[PDB]
């Protein structure tokens, strides 16, 4: 169906296991990852993960902390990549997409993906 | 309830991390996330990173006896890994959320 297309993604031996890519993510915040990679790595979860929202959720905090200069020099297109985090979280949040890495969406979780949809929503990272 | 609301008490200790709110609240979240969300790992996770990075200083003035933390925040995190706990609240748990528990559980036994 579509639980084909995820066959085989999931089948690619190019696949980062979701494990490490989130804890690739959450080295950024610090300062002591690779924020060269953060396209890529965006590109990996949007591919491989299209449905999780914890690894959003991390990426939200990026761009929320982050200083416009730094995002600008990782990231081609900041605000573009804002508008494609906050398009996967707000797929998880209504069910368009399933499965979430970061776990079942009961209740809390959709209200913290809210409230990342809203910060999201409040940022402009456009020059 | 005086039950902070999951995601505000997430975003507080967020903050906490990045440098914003106040440092000394840290005892009072980690205090309210033992309370009320005995079975929740997305906290304890981003704690460990604020544990993990700050200085020696910084942990003994704010954080009286910061060992000791350590040692719950790792506490919670292995009960809800070997099923000690339930949800409630406020994140499930499978193979993907067991690994990078187990991660954080790695990150706490090294410090």
Redesign the interface.
């Known amino acids: 169906e579509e639980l084909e297309a995820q066959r085989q993604r999931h089948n690619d031996p190019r696949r980062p296991p979701?494990?490490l890519l989130?804890?690739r993510v959450?080295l950024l915040?610090?300062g002591?990852g690779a924020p060269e990679d953060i396209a890529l790595m965006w590109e990996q979860t949007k591919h491989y993960y299209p449905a999780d929202w914890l690894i959003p959720l991390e990426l939200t905090?990026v761009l929320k902390?982050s200083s416009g200069k730094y995002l600008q020099t990782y990231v081609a297109d900041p605000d573009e990549m804002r508008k494609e985090v906050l398009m996967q979280l707000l797929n998880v949040k209504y069910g368009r997409v399933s499965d979430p890495?970061?776990?079942?969406v009961?209740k809390?979780?959709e209200?913290?993906i809210?409230?990342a949809v809203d910060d999201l929503e409040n940022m402009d990272l456009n020059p």
Request: overall charge neutral; hydrophobic content about 25%.
């Open positions: 979701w494990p989130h804890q959450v915040r610090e002591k905090q902390y890495n970061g776990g079942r009961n809390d979780v209200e913290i809210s409230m």
